[PDB]
């Protein structure tokens, strides 16, 4: 037989120094790290669509019960969880008439219609930000479903409903959050179906997006995102050592310019003088020509890693003692030679590659349940298989539906001991501030890096983008 060693589930710290493996359970009992007095929310959308948002906000003011509390914890209400005040009273509402959205949406050109629809919302948001006295913490952008289902690529407008730009991305969300980057306005896009879906029904009459049993989790993952965007700390990691910066590189394709040009983006995590965690993006997007390189040539590699090290020195004082450059692609020697040069003598630079491609799947002998989450099949000192997706007993179910696929972790460069590499990625899979779940399937460096790349490659006019995730997730 071949041994598989299990890594203890990481604990995330909450208010009053309390630790808990689960984010929802720990947050519902101990509260968040910082005190947000209240969320002055701004609302933009149809006047008809404002009613749905008001109803949902009044709903989440009250406790919400899900089908099986053991599988997923119930929601005790926004104020009970967060100690932060959020009513439907005090929302600044900017009206978007149905005629306005019908003016642009019913167009033959998809890119033109998407650009106009994004401009329609962003102009009102900017006007409210600049020329209105009312202060709003976060702008909830309610979008209808006709716009949603015909404002993304590959959406063919039917001929009977066509009534009547190309430098940008045809995706509403990406372009939307890209064009607001210069103004630094935290926003949260909502579909009318994500909101009170019960009105929207299919042909059979049932809701299309039935969230009847998952209502509590929906409230959990909306309230946490709203709290994060307003400047609140939901939770933090506890087992991360001092002097360890991580950084995660993801390469995205850029189609607006001729040749994909393969922009590179990064997300950075470390600790502070004290105990505070810093999870901020570190993006200066360094474009890489050639169609399928995905390998960053030495000048921009030096730029990326020098920015990463300086952003750590500026906040802690001295250089990280071990940088764990995680990435979803393998490293050829060209980056690492450049990377070594900028790094000092004391810093131990490590490049770790994480992949889901490898087709290994563990099927347990008996029982209708999948492998326990935390098992690591260590192939050797440099490579290993880790099951970040799987069963954890507290949530009563697996994180996946079928038998989950493990993460292929290989220490491509540097030396690093494999146990610590496997013990930090599992820890990283818990800081997904975009969702209030038990744990993530992939480390949040490679996830928030992917998101920040998908947002920063939609607009070419961006310059010195914000590094806070409020403006990205």
């Amino acid at each position: 037989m071949k041994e598989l060693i299990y890594i203890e589930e990481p604990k995330i710290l909450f208010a009053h120094g309390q630790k808990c493996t689960d984010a929802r359970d720990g947050l519902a009992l101990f509260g968040p790290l910082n005190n947000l007095y209240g969320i002055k929310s701004g609302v933009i959308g149809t006047k008809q669509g404002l009613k749905i948002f008001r109803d949902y906000l009044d709903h989440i003011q009250k406790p919400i019960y899900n089908s099986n509390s053991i599988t997923r914890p119930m929601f005790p209400g926004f104020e009970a969880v967060f100690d932060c005040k959020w009513e439907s009273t005090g929302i600044t509402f900017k009206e978007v008439t149905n005629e306005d959205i019908g003016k642009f949406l019913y167009n033959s050109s998809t890119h033109k219609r998407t650009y106009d629809l994004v401009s329609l919302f962003i102009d009102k948001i900017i006007s409210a930000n600049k020329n209105e006295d009312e202060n709003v913490d976060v702008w909830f952008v309610i979008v209808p479903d006709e716009i949603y289902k015909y404002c993304r690529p590959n959406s063919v407008l039917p001929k009977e409903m066509v009534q009547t730009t190309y430098n940008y991305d045809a995706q509403f969300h990406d372009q939307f959050k890209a064009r607001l980057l210069k103004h630094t306005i935290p926003t949260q896009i909502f579909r009318e179906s994500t909101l009170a879906w019960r009105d929207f029904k299919n042909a059979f009459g049932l809701p299309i997006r039935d969230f009847s049993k998952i209502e509590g989790h929906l409230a959990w993952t909306i309230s946490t995102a709203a709290f994060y965007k307003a400047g609140g700390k939901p939770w933090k990691l506890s087992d991360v050592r001092n002097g360890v910066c991580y950084l995660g590189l993801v390469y995205k394709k850029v189609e607006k310019s001729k040749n994909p040009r393969n922009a590179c983006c990064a997300a950075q995590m470390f600790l502070d003088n004290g105990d505070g965690t810093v999870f901020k993006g570190e993006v200066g997007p360094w474009y890489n020509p050639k169609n399928g390189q995905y390998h960053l040539e030495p000048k921009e590699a030096k730029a990326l890693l020098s920015q990463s090290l300086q952003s750590y020195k500026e906040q802690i004082g001295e250089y990280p003692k071990e940088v764990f450059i995680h990435a979803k692609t393998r490293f050829n020697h060209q980056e690492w030679d450049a990377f070594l040069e900028v790094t000092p003598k004391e810093t131990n630079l490590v490049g770790v590659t994480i992949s889901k491609t490898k087709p290994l799947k563990l099927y347990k002998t008996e029982g209708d349940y999948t492998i326990l989450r935390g098992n690591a099949y260590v192939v050797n000192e440099r490579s290993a298989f880790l099951w970040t997706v799987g069963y954890v007993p507290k949530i009563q179910t697996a994180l996946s539906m079928e038998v989950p696929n493990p993460l292929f972790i290989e220490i491509n460069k540097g030396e690093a001991d494999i146990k610590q590499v496997l013990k930090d990625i599992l820890s990283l899979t818990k800081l997904n501030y975009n969702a209030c779940i038990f744990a993530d399937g992939e480390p949040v460096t490679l996830r928030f890096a992917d998101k920040i790349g998908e947002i920063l490659t939609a607009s070419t006019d961006i310059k010195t983008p914000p590094l806070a995730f409020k403006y990205y997730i």
């Binding site: 041994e3 203890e8 808990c20 009992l29 005790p76 100690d83 290994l360 099927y363 507290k394 079928e402």
Partner: protein, 418 residues
């Protein structure tokens, strides 16, 4: 002295609010007694409740809800609380907490109908603030607030019944160990004998052209039929290599490199798997990159191997279990197998629409858990067996590779229970 707070409620219905309130109050420093708190029960709890109410309780909180309104145990506890209130000469003893909106104040219990209640119906936090303020006003006994007590109690009782436990479990993977390889990899000097504009994928045994050397594990004259010119080839022109050294990694040279000699084995093994599937007379569904093989409706006796069904019906769509095999030499010599589900409308011809195929695959895999994947995968593998313990893939008239029909079993020292 009386320094404990009693919380009456309906046990099978109001666990969520009672749990939240108790775990909050304990963290705030208030001694709390509740039936959901203590883990395990015995016959003694009936007298325990009465003695606690009559001798230790300082405040009696009644969770008022449509369930707890007319619950016999709740009513008995409320009556004992009323008697204790009369005895103690303290009017502000029972503090009802209404948490249900469908329970109007005009339909609450007679023992409560006269009592001012704290409103939890709209916001729980406002109700908790009211509870705390009433407790400081009435000077309820209190200790210094310590959330760690609530954390300890939560870990001890509630994250407690479902925890990591140590007990060894064996796991079944989708990796099939390879028992043996031929002794040597043969580099035939065919040259002009094999036509330059010829395809090696139609030739009988696996063979890939490298430089001017046909890379295969077969014997030199195994390839006479498709290559009639190869009748007069000299066997001394082969550069046969000790394959075991290649797997170890010792061999490397200008002629061939371990990186480029081990990538030529997996192509041979992959084509050999394809040829074995063709020999097994199982059909194929072409995917984006890989070719997967599924079994017809009727080839197996009653469309099932062993006691496990591999072909079934879903309305008019006959779902077919499929596998795909790929060889990787990096970790171990392994022929990995993947699980795939494909659908047919008549049991013989595949549906060409990708959208309906994907939708049907998702709908059918909706309810297939671990045991429904492992069982079918091992059943298909056992159906592919040549013997009781292993099956061979043909790489020559005399050369074969034995691949186990038993997937690589791993071992874990941690597991759990349903």
């Amino acid at each position: 002295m009386r320094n404990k707070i009693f919380i009456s409620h309906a046990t099978p219905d109001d666990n969520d609010f009672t749990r939240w309130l108790a775990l909050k109050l304990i963290g705030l420093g208030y001694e709390v007694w509740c039936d959901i708190l203590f883990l395990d029960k015995g016959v003694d709890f009936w007298s325990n409740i009465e003695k606690v109410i009559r001798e230790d309780t300082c405040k009696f909180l009644l969770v008022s809800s449509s369930y707890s309104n007319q619950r016999e145990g709740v009513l008995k506890e409320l009556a004992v609380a009323a008697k204790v209130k009369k005895q103690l000469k303290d009017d502000k003893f029972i503090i009802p907490l209404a948490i249900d909106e469908q329970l109007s104040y005009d339909d609450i219990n007679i023992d409560i109908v006269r009592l001012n209640a704290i409103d939890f119906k709209m916001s729980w936090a406002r109700g908790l603030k009211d509870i705390l303020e009433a407790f400081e006003k009435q000077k309820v006994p209190k200790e210094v607030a310590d959330a760690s007590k609530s954390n300890l109690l939560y870990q001890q009782i509630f994250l407690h019944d479902k925890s990591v436990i140590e007990k060894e479990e064996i796991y079944d993977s989708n990796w099939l160990s390879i028992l043996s390889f031929p002794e040597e990899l043969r580099f035939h000097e065919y040259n002009w004998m094999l036509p330059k504009r010829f395809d090696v994928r139609e030739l009988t045994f696996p063979a890939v052209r490298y430089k001017n050397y046909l890379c295969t594990f077969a014997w030199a004259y195994d390839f006479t039929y498709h290559l009639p010119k190869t009748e007069t080839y000299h066997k001394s022109k082969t550069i046969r290599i000790p394959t075991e050294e290649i797997l170890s990694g010792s061999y490397d040279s200008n002629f061939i490199r371990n990186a480029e000699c081990k990538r030529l084995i997996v192509q041979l093994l992959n084509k050999a798997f394809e040829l074995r599937m063709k020999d097994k007379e199982v059909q194929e569904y072409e995917m984006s990159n890989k070719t997967a093989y599924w079994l017809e409706k009727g080839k197996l006796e009653k469309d099932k191997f062993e006691k496990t069904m591999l072909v079934g019906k879903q309305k008019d769509k006959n779902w077919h279990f499929a596998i795909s095999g790929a060889s990787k030499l990096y970790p171990f010599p392994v022929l990995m197998i993947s699980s795939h589900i494909f659908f047919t409308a008549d049991g013989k011809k595949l549906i060409d629409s990708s959208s309906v195929q994907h939708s049907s695959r998702r709908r059918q895999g909706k309810n297939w858990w671990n045991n429904t994947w492992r069982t079918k995968l091992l059943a298909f593998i056992k159906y592919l067996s040549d013997d009781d313990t292993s099956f061979y893939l043909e790489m020559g008239s005399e050369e074969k590779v034995f691949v186990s029909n038993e997937p690589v079993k791993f071992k874990g020292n941690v597991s759990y229970n349903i």
